[PDB]
Amino acid sequence: PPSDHLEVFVNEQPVKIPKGSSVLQACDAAGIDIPRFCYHQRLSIAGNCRMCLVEVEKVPKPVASCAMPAGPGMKIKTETPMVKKAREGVMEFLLINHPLDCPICDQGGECDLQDQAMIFGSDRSRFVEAKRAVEDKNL
Amino acid sequence: TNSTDIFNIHKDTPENNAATSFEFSEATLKVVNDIIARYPPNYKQSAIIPVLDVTQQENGGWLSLAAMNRVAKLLDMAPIRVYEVATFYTMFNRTKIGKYHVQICGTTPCRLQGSQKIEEAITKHLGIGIGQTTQDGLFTLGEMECMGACVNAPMVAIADYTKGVSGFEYIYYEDLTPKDIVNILDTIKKGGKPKPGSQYRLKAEPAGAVHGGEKWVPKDGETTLTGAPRAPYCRDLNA
Amino acid sequence: VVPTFDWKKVPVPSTTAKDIPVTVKGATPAGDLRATSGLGLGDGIKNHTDKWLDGDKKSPMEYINEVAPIKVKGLVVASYGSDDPALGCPVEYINLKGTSLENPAVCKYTGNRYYSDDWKG
Amino acid sequence: RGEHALRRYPTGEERCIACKLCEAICPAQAITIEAEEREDGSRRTTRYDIDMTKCIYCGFCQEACPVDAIVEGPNFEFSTETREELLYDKQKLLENGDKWETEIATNLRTESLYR
Amino acid sequence: AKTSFGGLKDEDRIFQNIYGRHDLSIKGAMSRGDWYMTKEIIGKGRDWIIDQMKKSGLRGRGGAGFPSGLKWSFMPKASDGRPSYLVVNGDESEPGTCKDREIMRHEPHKLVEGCLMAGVAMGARAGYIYIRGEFVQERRAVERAISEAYAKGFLGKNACGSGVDFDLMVHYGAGAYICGEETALIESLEGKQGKPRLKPPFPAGVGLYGCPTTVTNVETVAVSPTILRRGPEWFSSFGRKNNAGTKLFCISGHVNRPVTVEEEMSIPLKELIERHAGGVRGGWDNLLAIIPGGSSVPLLPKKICDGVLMDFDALKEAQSGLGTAAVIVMDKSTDVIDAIARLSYFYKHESCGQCTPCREGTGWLYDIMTRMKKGDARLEEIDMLWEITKQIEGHTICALGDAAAWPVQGLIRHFRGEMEERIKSAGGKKKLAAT
Amino acid sequence: EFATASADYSIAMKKAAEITGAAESAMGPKEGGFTAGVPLDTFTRKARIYAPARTASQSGLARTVDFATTTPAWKIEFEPTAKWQNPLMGWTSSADPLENVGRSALVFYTKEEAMRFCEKLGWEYEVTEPNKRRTQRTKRYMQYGDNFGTKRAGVPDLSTLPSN
Ligand SMILES: Cc1cc2nc3c(=O)[nH]c(=O)nc-3n(C[C@H](O)[C@H](O)[C@H](O)COP(=O)(O)O)c2cc1C
Ligand code: SF4
Ligand code: SF4
Ligand code: SF4
Ligand code: FES
Ligand code: FES
Structure with missing residues (x-):
């Protein structure tokens, strides 16, 4: 085979991954668990939550690691100041319209949004506007 | 999303329910089948936006649940995809409107030219605000974003639904004052045809401007392309 | 080809079918599935309020049913449960479009009911 | 920090919404809660017990409550002759709140400036 | 090399009938030089047309400014099993921009011949034109030109008697500004909501129906036959280096003579406005601010505008961009916070809602700007506003998030004193009730 | 280069587990239960050695065997014994002394460490290997393109x- 396993660098550590793997899968093979909301292993890739944003060398923008394929010799950084600022900003955008519903919500205690806000987000908000309200649906 | 449509879910009405019937006429079905042939057969779903537009003139200016379900059956796609497309785009009305749909641009290049005074004139004359229909069922007032007529700002577009698909007219009326839009509305109400385009010049050529949204002030100056048009010409493509 | 399935000819045991916990109108459609736990089953109690209240005492659900819905101007309302926001619940933003006096919207914290005559209706 | 009590809104609806935060924070494990949904769709408790002989009277449950439903009221004179009289269920705690509501509200009008 | 640019002659303008003054049929277009020597140009070859378009220095007129010759060369050169598609962008929903309306309404045969030239240059078998749904008469005129070009055998099998096959079709939208983005336009053309795809993949690799596809602007497509006939050296003789050619400019707002006019690139703003448009309403000293490139680029104040050239590599160094070269002029009677607030409302209204920062933060930007217009804010909320724009920008799927952040950045940068004075003087009517 | 959790006190925990003389301590079977001083019928019960799978409700992987070298993930669990309801209040009653001691306190880095603890204490054990996650996606929707x-x-x- 023409080198069916390619080598990438995650935080200066060499990682061998199968071909066609994304940046997120290379981060997972390096022992790093990237925060995510829309990616799933069993579903198709969407790339709309913007929580999986990491930094790749010679790219001026944060890339979405779930959707971006991993190229040969790629250098991935997951703990630079722009990655942490990106995570806090995306979490702040996720929380401005969310209802203050954790006491009455059934996910409280096993919530991805709560735990990811505790770990990768900030501790304050600066939002004092009115929120979006949605009627419920019968399914 | 537009005006007049505050719901992104279906609300049952005696006029609008699952029991309501829609069917195409012969000529409209010919038009729809001609639209479908523009696209590959295995990608027949590409034809949804023009077909839904034609269905909107056929039904009388708005899409009902029955019309959307008929379009879904016609293009062999699930109805939820059709509901997605119909709720995504601004021109698709999903509630019953009037015979003429008056849409005014409100974006900043029209706003500097005094679109707010034109809105005030329309509301003082017709007696309705944005998102409303008159009690006679004649006019529906709506707001739009930039319509690509900014050098002739401020402008109004008016949609004609009184003649069905064959006589559908979407007419821009540009370089307006309160008097111009009042006259256009009176001309439509009296049964005449108001003049399309700008009310004080032909096209986007250099002439005056509406000063303060109340008065056209003509101004002379340099105009290009005033001479004879250019002759055909080609260089020697060989070497 | 692919014949339709008749669900109306499917048998359900009568002991099971007559014991479905359902809801009155409130915050749901009337008649949908009501979640229950096992408490009170040994004492034969199928009602929510009877599991902790004994007697002909006035229940909290009968208290909130006597307060009429409140007319609010606008499309969204903020519910605190008090005049002072420090003394009430976390703020709840409740949709008011599509609402009337007959079908109002209810706060999930307080049970107060709201409606608006502003959604072109 | 005196005798525990359960509170209502001025309408007469319970403030408690069965979030189980006071049960989680309780270092003595003196609280036992069960819940299901009420017939109008509301999220309410069916059991709310406080073992007053297990309680340490810390007030952590009062801090954890986001709707001010459980409080420690101003009562300290509640000695009994049997220990079964000190295993409070939900009905007695609501009765305590209905007894002490005006005093609790007067106290909370001052203590809300600090908390 | 020439140093002073502007004052383009009438004999060098590409669009000789941009005002619709002459006959609009195919005999009038063919007598004015359109459809001339098309078979001879096609017979030169694909590589020849690519090289000639590369040498002209023509950049993308859609708003980004990528070189058109290298972009057209991204298409594959051989056969793998899939056909190739040309798609031409005639959405033009940018606020201030009304040049493609004129090209589609008054010179459609230039657009059709350019579609043929670009499709031959990229190996494309079929073509689609995505016209705006609000442009009904423009769509009718384009379809008339397409029917006329079919009736003379210019489009179809054995196109212009050259042996190459090309077909042209008309699609139209239904009122979404986001459908001007490339992959969003493909998604709407495929029969879906106009929500952009993530890149990679790229449309020249996987585009419409999974096939190689190039999306190009109407004005980019239409100038190509004149460039091929009159030469790349003629086209590159206008404007600065790397900034070649002529450009349609739309001047709107507080201007005595608003106009869509063709002019040489690298012309100054003051020259472009005082001539061809009658100057600023009330004199040049009554100028307050100018947006030089539509709505997605930051505004400029009076000091930068007096001297800056309308150019790609000149507005960018002035912390702005050329964009679509749509010029919006405000005077000293303008509330510039109110104008940028209505722009924020536009970007809130036009968000497609796919990704988190655009969908949630455009409404937040609009709320903050609405509070800033009345002065009901705090002074540090301005720095918060800058931080929120930096949180949206560069963090989204497509470039509408950047286009939503950029006007607020320009407003803060050039008029922070106005915002601070609006906050401070609002307390002359709000703190008299607190005491 | 070597950097495997090289910025915390766990470096000072991995060594101090390999100090010479103390890294080779070993006892015979059932001997640690004789000196533990707990009743000997406790070691007639059965134990399970297993690593618990990821919860279905969440997507994070921290409490799995993926981070086995970083965090102890292997558990020792016992079968349930009788429970009933209190007649006066309804609280759940039990007579099981090992009701929460394996699930709260006993965690191990590997399977063999938990086996060694069970062998020296005298518990009979069954070992359950966890199910391995698959990372390769389907042929359809393999990539975003x-x-x-x-x-x-x-x-x-x-x-x-x-x-x-
Ligand atoms: C929000 C948004 C709107 C756009 N609208 C248009 C448009 O109306 N017309 C256009 O030609 N390009 C538009 N573009 C740019 C296209 O994505 C694309 O870059 C351009 O059409 C390519 O044409 P070119 O040949 O000039 O490079 C838009 C881009 C964005 C992000
Ligand atoms: S006061 Fe302390 S001991 Fe009493 S119920 Fe609250 S947390 Fe438990
Ligand atoms: S008393 Fe308060 S904290 Fe305790 S369950 Fe009820 S709402 Fe939650
Ligand atoms: S930036 Fe806005 S328009 Fe673009 S994909 Fe994201 S939400 Fe949609
Ligand atoms: S996980 Fe949501 S953008 Fe990648
Ligand atoms: S702003 Fe009104 S047409 Fe563009």
Whole structure:
């Protein structure tokens, strides 16, 4: 085979991954668990939550690691100041319209949004506007 | 999303329910089948936006649940995809409107030219605000974003639904004052045809401007392309 | 080809079918599935309020049913449960479009009911 | 920090919404809660017990409550002759709140400036 | 090399009938030089047309400014099993921009011949034109030109008697500004909501129906036959280096003579406005601010505008961009916070809602700007506003998030004193009730 | 280069586990239960050595065997004994002394460490190997570009074009 396993660098550590793997899968093979909301292993890739944003060398923008394929010799950084600022900003955008519903919500205690806000987000908000309200649906 | 449509879910009405019937006429079905042939057969779903537009003139200016379900059956796609497309785009009305749909641009290049005074004139004359229909069922007032007529700002577009698909007219009326839009509305109400385009010049050529949204002030100056048009010409493509 | 399935000819045991916990109108459609736990089953109690209240005492659900819905101007309302926001619940933003006096919207914290005559209706 | 009590809104609806935060924070494990949904769709408790002989009277449950439903009221004179009289269920705690509501509200009008 | 640019002659303008003054049929277009020597140009070859378009220095007129010759060369050169598609962008929903309306309404045969030239240059078998749904008469005129070009055998099998096959079709939208983005336009053309795809993949690799596809602007497509006939050296003789050619400019707002006019690139703003448009309403000293490139680029104040050239590599160094070269002029009677607030409302209204920062933060930007217009804010909320724009920008799927952040950045940068004075003087009517 | 959790006190925990003389301590079977001083019928019960799978409600992987070298994930669990309801209050009553001691306190880095603890204490054990996650995606939707590929409906036929 023409080198069916390619080598990438995650935080200066060499990682061998199968071909066609994304940046997120290379981060997972390096022992790093990237925060995510829309990616799933069993579903198709969407790339709309913007929580999986990491930094790749010679790219001026944060890339979405779930959707971006991993190229040969790629250098991935997951703990630079722009990655942490990106995570806090995306979490702040996720929380401005969310209802203050954790006491009455059934996910409280096993919530991805709560735990990811505790770990990768900030501790304050600066939002004092009115929120979006949605009627419920019968399914 | 537009005006007049505050719901992104279906609300049952005696006029609008699952029991309501829609069917195409012969000529409209010919038009729809001609639209479908523009696209590959295995990608027949590409034809949804023009077909839904034609269905909107056929039904009388708005899409009902029955019309959307008929379009879904016609293009062999699930109805939820059709509901997605119909709720995504601004021109698709999903509630019953009037015979003429008056849409005014409100974006900043029209706003500097005094679109707010034109809105005030329309509301003082017709007696309705944005998102409303008159009690006679004649006019529906709506707001739009930039319509690509900014050098002739401020402008109004008016949609004609009184003649069905064959006589559908979407007419821009540009370089307006309160008097111009009042006259256009009176001309439509009296049964005449108001003049399309700008009310004080032909096209986007250099002439005056509406000063303060109340008065056209003509101004002379340099105009290009005033001479004879250019002759055909080609260089020697060989070497 | 692919014949339709008749669900109306499917048998359900009568002991099971007559014991479905359902809801009155409130915050749901009337008649949908009501979640229950096992408490009170040994004492034969199928009602929510009877599991902790004994007697002909006035229940909290009968208290909130006597307060009429409140007319609010606008499309969204903020519910605190008090005049002072420090003394009430976390703020709840409740949709008011599509609402009337007959079908109002209810706060999930307080049970107060709201409606608006502003959604072109 | 005196005798525990359960509170209502001025309408007469319970403030408690069965979030189980006071049960989680309780270092003595003196609280036992069960819940299901009420017939109008509301999220309410069916059991709310406080073992007053297990309680340490810390007030952590009062801090954890986001709707001010459980409080420690101003009562300290509640000695009994049997220990079964000190295993409070939900009905007695609501009765305590209905007894002490005006005093609790007067106290909370001052203590809300600090908390 | 020439140093002073502007004052383009009438004999060098590409669009000789941009005002619709002459006959609009195919005999009038063919007598004015359109459809001339098309078979001879096609017979030169694909590589020849690519090289000639590369040498002209023509950049993308859609708003980004990528070189058109290298972009057209991204298409594959051989056969793998899939056909190739040309798609031409005639959405033009940018606020201030009304040049493609004129090209589609008054010179459609230039657009059709350019579609043929670009499709031959990229190996494309079929073509689609995505016209705006609000442009009904423009769509009718384009379809008339397409029917006329079919009736003379210019489009179809054995196109212009050259042996190459090309077909042209008309699609139209239904009122979404986001459908001007490339992959969003493909998604709407495929029969879906106009929500952009993530890149990679790229449309020249996987585009419409999974096939190689190039999306190009109407004005980019239409100038190509004149460039091929009159030469790349003629086209590159206008404007600065790397900034070649002529450009349609739309001047709107507080201007005595608003106009869509063709002019040489690298012309100054003051020259472009005082001539061809009658100057600023009330004199040049009554100028307050100018947006030089539509709505997605930051505004400029009076000091930068007096001297800056309308150019790609000149507005960018002035912390702005050329964009679509749509010029919006405000005077000293303008509330510039109110104008940028209505722009924020536009970007809130036009968000497609796919990704988190655009969908949630455009409404937040609009709320903050609405509070800033009345002065009901705090002074540090301005720095918060800058931080929120930096949180949206560069963090989204497509470039509408950047286009939503950029006007607020320009407003803060050039008029922070106005915002601070609006906050401070609002307390002359709000703190008299607190005491 | 070597950097495997090289910024915390766990470096000072991995060594101090390999100090010489103390890294080779070993006892015979059931001997640690004789000196533990707990009743000997406790060691007639059965134990399970297993690593618990990821919860279905969340997507994070921290409490799994993926981070086995970083965090202790192997557990020792016992079968349940009788429970009943209190007649006065309804609280759940039990007589099991090992009701929460394995699930709260006993965690191990590897399977063999938990086996060694069970062997020296005298518990009979069964070991359950956890199910391995699969990372390779399906052929359809393998990459993001397969959402928009030609596998949706095939290559489009160009037979509805004008001039066919
Ligand atoms: C929000 C948004 C709107 C756009 N609208 C248009 C448009 O109306 N017309 C256009 O030609 N390009 C538009 N574009 C740019 C296209 O994505 C694309 O870059 C351009 O059409 C390519 O044409 P070119 O040949 O000039 O490079 C838009 C881009 C974005 C992000
Ligand atoms: S006061 Fe302390 S001991 Fe009493 S119920 Fe609250 S947390 Fe438990
Ligand atoms: S008393 Fe308060 S904290 Fe305790 S369950 Fe009820 S709402 Fe939650
Ligand atoms: S930036 Fe806005 S328009 Fe673009 S994909 Fe994201 S939400 Fe949609
Ligand atoms: S996980 Fe949501 S953008 Fe990648
Ligand atoms: S701003 Fe009104 S047409 Fe563009």
